[PDB]
């Protein structure tokens, strides 16, 4: 069995990745 | 503030003159060349251009790039018009010709700013051009093994080379073999109108097929064409320009009836005339009846009950190819039909390649035409494939009749610069600065063949200079090993005419730019 199930459907689903992309945009700016 | 007469001479006309106008004209040529700089060589990239309709074209051929750039500068257009000619005369001479022609101007650009009147430059360009062209003729190689496997291998190597810089990686052996054999199907005119290419969506590149005969796409039909089975093992083909509708009229007749006896006679006569034509078509064996004109419901059922197949509304382009593919003739009137005008083939079937219905003919031994069916996963994917087939056919067609070939890559361009330098070092005076400039521009080809994919451009060009000055002159730039390779021994050959015409067109382009001192632009534009 999977021993539980949790549905994660909320605004953080996109933020957790958007913040990383913004940081990459600057990190490469001075490469 | 100066041209302020009480009465104007013309209207409002713009006029430039002198050194800034020549520099501007050369600069415009340098900028437009940027559109193809990255398209040269086996490792060039493709470009995506969107037109005003919203449709994109993906291609890398200079003859398709330069026509979509919307060039307006009077001078930049010069490097486009010469592409229009090379597309006919040569084929491969696209990106290479544009880049060389632009470089011819760059090499003299830093000098034309400070004296050096173009009258002396034009004469030097003509001298250097004639020298370079003669040198090609003295080094081109030929074969004496016509009508042998040696000529087949020559044509195959020409095709595999022609397929370079395309959307082709491992399919060269697949397409190249069919291109060479497809052309050998033609008569001794090698007229390209005898080779059709048709796109059918669905499947991979390796799933394409070369059909010795022809096929049509099964256009608009009527109720009753679900019948007429599509299994034939020895059909005859009637190509007719006859109307088989009940409503066929002369458009200028009126049938005036005064009694019931003639009323019915006209009604029956209209049906009888149609049946008369159909019965004359029958008793011929022409189990396949094709026409560019409509075939109506009555004829469809007549043919079905007679165990015959028909299909109308066939375009004239395919009927003419069908005539040449089936070995027959096209007859307009049915009143003189016989067995001596019909075509013949062995197999006639309706297939489902890609989901759409296609009616294929094959088996005629006297097929003067052929059709190559392309399969692919997208419209643009097949469109680019079609372009690669047109160029490969063009190079092979020419190689059959002209077996004079030269080393590919930059190998010939390095030798041409060597010959010109040997010439220039025997000439006194101002010519040393002009013949050399022509020669220096010739290295743009081995340079760009490296800049687009690395290969340590600085040092690999130095190697070509060291090798060609001491040993053989067939050394070029490899793709697999990042160093020099002998293109002659590797059989990397291109028709001699590709470079001969490239030199002529590039030279004339330079003379059109440097010979202009003034530009006059009428203000009337609405």
């Amino acid at each position: 069995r999977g021993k539980g199930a949790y549905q994660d459907r909320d605004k953080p689903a996109q933020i957790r990745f958007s913040n990383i992309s913004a940081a990459k945009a600057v990190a490469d700016a001075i490469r | 503030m100066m041209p302020t007469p009480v009465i104007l001479l013309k209207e409002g006309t713009d006029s430039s003159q002198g050194i800034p106008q020549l520099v501007s004209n050369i600069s415009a040529c340098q900028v437009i060349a940027e559109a193809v700089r990255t398209t040269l060589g086996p490792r060039g990239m493709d470009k995506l251009i969107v037109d005003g309709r919203g449709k994109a074209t993906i291609s890398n051929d200079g003859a398709t790039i330069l026509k979509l750039l919307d060039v307006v500068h009077p001078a930049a257009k010069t490097l486009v018009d010469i592409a229009k000619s090379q597309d006919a005369e040569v084929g491969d001479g696209t990106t290479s010709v544009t880049l060389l022609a632009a470089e011819f101007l760059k090499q003299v650009k830093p000098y034309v700013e400070e004296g050096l009147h173009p009258q002396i430059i034009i004469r030097a360009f003509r001298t250097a051009t004639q020298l370079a062209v003669n040198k090609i003729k003295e080094i081109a190689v030929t074969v004496k093994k016509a009508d042998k496997v040696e000529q087949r291998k020559l044509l195959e190597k020409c095709a595999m080379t022609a397929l370079s810089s395309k959307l082709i990686s491992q399919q060269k052996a697949f397409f190249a073999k069919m291109v060479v054999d497809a052309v050998m199907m033609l008569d001794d005119l090698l007229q390209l109108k005898m080779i059709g290419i048709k796109k059918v969506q669905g499947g991979a590149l390796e799933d394409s097929q070369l059909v010795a005969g022809v096929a049509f796409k099964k256009t608009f039909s009527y109720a009753g064409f679900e019948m007429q089975p599509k299994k034939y093992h020895n059909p005859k083909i009637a190509l007719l320009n006859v109307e088989l509708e009940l409503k066929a009229e002369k458009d200028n007749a009126e049938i005036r009836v005064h009694t019931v006896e003639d009323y019915q006679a006209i009604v029956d006569a209209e049906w009888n005339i149609l049946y008369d034509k159909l019965e004359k078509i029958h008793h011929s064996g022409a189990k396949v009846v094709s026409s560019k004109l409509p075939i109506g419901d009555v004829a469809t059922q007549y043919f079905a009950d007679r165990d015959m197949f028909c299909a109308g509304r066939v375009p004239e382009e395919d009927l003419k190819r069908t005539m040449m593919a089936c070995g027959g003739s096209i007859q307009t009137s049915v009143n003189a039909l016989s067995a001596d005008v019909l075509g013949r083939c062995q197999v006639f079937e309706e297939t489902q390649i890609g989901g759409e219905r296609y009616n294929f003919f094959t088996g005629c031994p006297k097929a003067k035409t052929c059709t190559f069916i392309l399969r692919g996963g997208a419209e643009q994917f097949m469109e680019e494939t079609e372009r690669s087939l047109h160029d490969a056919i063009m190079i092979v067609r020419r190689a059959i009749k002209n077996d004079s070939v030269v080393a590919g890559g930059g190998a010939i361009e390095m030798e041409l610069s060597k010959y010109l330098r040997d010439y220039s070092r025997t000439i006194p005076g101002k010519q040393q600065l002009l013949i050399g400039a022509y020669a220096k521009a010739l290295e743009i080809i081995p340079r760009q063949l490296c800049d687009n994919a690395g290969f340590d451009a600085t040092n690999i060009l130095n190697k070509l200079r060291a090798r060609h000055a001491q040993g053989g002159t067939w050394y070029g730039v490899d793709i697999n090993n990042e160093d020099i390779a002998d293109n002659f021994e590797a059989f990397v050959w291109e028709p001699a005419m590709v470079r001969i015409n490239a030199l002529t067109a590039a030279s004339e382009a330079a003379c059109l730019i440097v010979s202009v001192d003034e530009t006059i632009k009428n203000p009337r534009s609405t």
């Binding site: - | 991979a204 009126e254 994919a453």
Partner: protein, 535 residues
């Protein structure tokens, strides 16, 4: 610079150059891959037995809820030249095979996503595209190694029904999981040509009428048309039909050309009145002389004809369309007769019970044919409680019919549930190190991309992709590689041989080939020239 030269003069090369945009570098390549991520993120949400549906709202306000990727991607308003190609990928798969409308987008996206690191490592954009070909050949060659079938298309149709169940299991019609699987098998095998392995798509018609339930969907061995008997008191039941298919109106024959009858005398006026009356009688008796007892006419009737049809006990319907009379004539073994005077018994159709069906309070009067003689055409009649489930049911049965046709074309199958994809990823990895000349990074990237499918399936199934993938991939190596896949409810074990998860070999072969070619033609681009504002 443009529009400014070193001499202060304007510098104009192309028309409206100030409204153009060009950016090459590696930014064109990253922009293409990034845009593809937006596409892949859409389709990954509808993969697997738990795939979620999309609601598509058309420009006119019409709304339909579908699962079929062909209906989702075809209704997009995306103005991006490469994202449009991602739709064409799903189209090519839909036209050739008809199954992987979701798979080819997810796979192609993974190849673009995994390629992102390869560009950042400094690998030439074209070397990446070529490297995928070296790895793809490995997956394709091994895909054809494991395959077996016992389907003969005669009576042992058990694996054929199972294939239909595998396909339909992803749709919204699982309330008819068995019923629609059996309908699809019977629909194709009764019209398929076993000699050539061809199935003519025109021999299976799909009709429907709103109302009832999915469980009321039936396969009718015959044709369904809109019945409208010209005479309202005409009996509505024929027990043994002798059917005359006619394409001529029941009115006095007229010429096609300009006529303009000249009438001068009273004898001419009155004589015509008699002759026309006789024409009405002859055209009806010419039908009865053939033994016909039901006429089906493309054209309408005169008022005079309807009375004669009654008195001669000759039922008939009116204004039956082109494709309807074409199908009726074929289904009944008859022929279309041009005129009344060409009628003969040899061209009559033969059929059994002819009836019209009334539905609730409406006046649809749909045809049912009970019995037929060696018919080569069938009709499916779809019911449903709303317009959306019926239209989706049409697509659900379409997919089921397509995979049956694919097995007829090629009877080689593979095991699904991710077993084929994981096995291919393992095979490529084993050969990825034989030999790591330049392409080591690219071939491994291909192997990783192949796993996007069992990983997305695991996510939609509610499982952790690391806990699931690490177990299956280990089990397929520790022992002789079984057909071990994944599932949501596990059904006991994940042995695809016992779950009967069957997919077509030629389907997956096309998914790999078409996805690879689409990726290549959009990687090898470094310049986009799209126009901006009009002015």
């Amino acid at each position: 610079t443009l529009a400014f030269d070193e001499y202060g003069r304007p510098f104009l090369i192309i028309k409206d150059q100030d409204r153009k945009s060009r950016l090459m570098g590696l930014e064109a390549l990253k922009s293409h891959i990034m845009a593809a991520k937006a596409v892949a993120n859409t389709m990954r949400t509808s993969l697997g037995p738990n795939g979620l549906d999309k609601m598509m709202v058309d420009k006119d306000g019409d709304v339909t809820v579908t699962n079929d990727g062909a209906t989702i991607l075809s209704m997009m308003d995306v103005d991006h030249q490469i994202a449009k190609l991602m739709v064409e990928l799903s189209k090519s798969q839909d036209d050739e095979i008809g199954d992987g409308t979701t798979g080819v987008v997810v796979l192609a996206g993974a190849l673009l996503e995994e390629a992102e690191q390869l560009l950042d490592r400094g690998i030439h954009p074209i070397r990446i595209a070529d490297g995928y070909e070296q790895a793809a050949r490995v997956a394709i060659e091994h895909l054809d190694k494991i395959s077996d079938s016992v389907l003969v298309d005669i009576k042992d149709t058990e694996p054929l029904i199972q294939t239909a169940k595998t396909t339909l299991g992803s749709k919204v019609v699982n309330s008819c999981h068995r019923q629609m699987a059996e309908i699809a098998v019977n629909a194709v095998l009764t019209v398929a040509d076993m000699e050539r392995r061809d199935v003519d798509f025109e021999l299976i018609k799909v009709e429907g009428k709103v109302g009832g339930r999915l469980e009321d969907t039936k396969l009718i061995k015959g044709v369904i048309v809109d019945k409208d008997f010209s005479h309202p008191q005409m009996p509505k039941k024929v027990e043994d039909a002798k059917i005359a298919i006619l394409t001529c109106p029941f009115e006095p024959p007229k010429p096609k050309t300009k006529h303009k009858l000249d009438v001068t005398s009273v004898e001419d006026y009155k004589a015509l009145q008699k002759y026309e009356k006789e024409k009405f009688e002859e055209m009806i008796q010419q039908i009865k002389e053939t033994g016909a007892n039901l006429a089906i006419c493309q054209w309408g009737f005169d008022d005079e004809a309807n009375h004669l049809l009654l008195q001669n006990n000759l039922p008939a319907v009116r204004w039956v369309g082109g494709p309807e009379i074409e199908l009726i004539a074929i289904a009944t073994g008859g022929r279309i007769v041009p005129r009344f005077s060409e009628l003969t018994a040899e061209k009559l159709g033969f059929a059994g019970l002819v009836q019209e069906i009334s539905f609730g309070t409406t006046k649809d009067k749909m045809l049912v044919i009970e019995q037929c003689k060696n018919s080569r055409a069938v009709t499916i009649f779809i019911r449903g409680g709303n317009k959306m489930i019926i239209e989706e049911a049409k697509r659900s049965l379409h997919d089921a019919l397509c995979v049956i046709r694919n097995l007829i074309r090629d009877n080689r199958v593979v095991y699904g549930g991710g077993a084929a994809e994981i096995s291919c990823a393992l095979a490529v990895s084993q050969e990825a190190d034989k030999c790591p000349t330049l392409e080591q990074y690219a071939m491994r990237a291909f192997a990783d991309a192949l796993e996007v499918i069992p990983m997305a399936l695991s996510e939609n199934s509610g499982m952790n992709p690391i806990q699931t993938m690490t177990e299956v991939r280990a089990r397929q190596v520790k022992e002789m590689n079984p057909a071990l896949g994944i599932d949501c409810l596990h059904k006991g074990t994940n042995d695809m041989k016992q779950q009967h998860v069957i997919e077509t070999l030629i389907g997956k072969k096309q998914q790999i080939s078409l996805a690879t070619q689409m990726v290549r033609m959009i990687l090898k681009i470094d310049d986009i020239r799209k126009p901006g504002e009009s002015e």
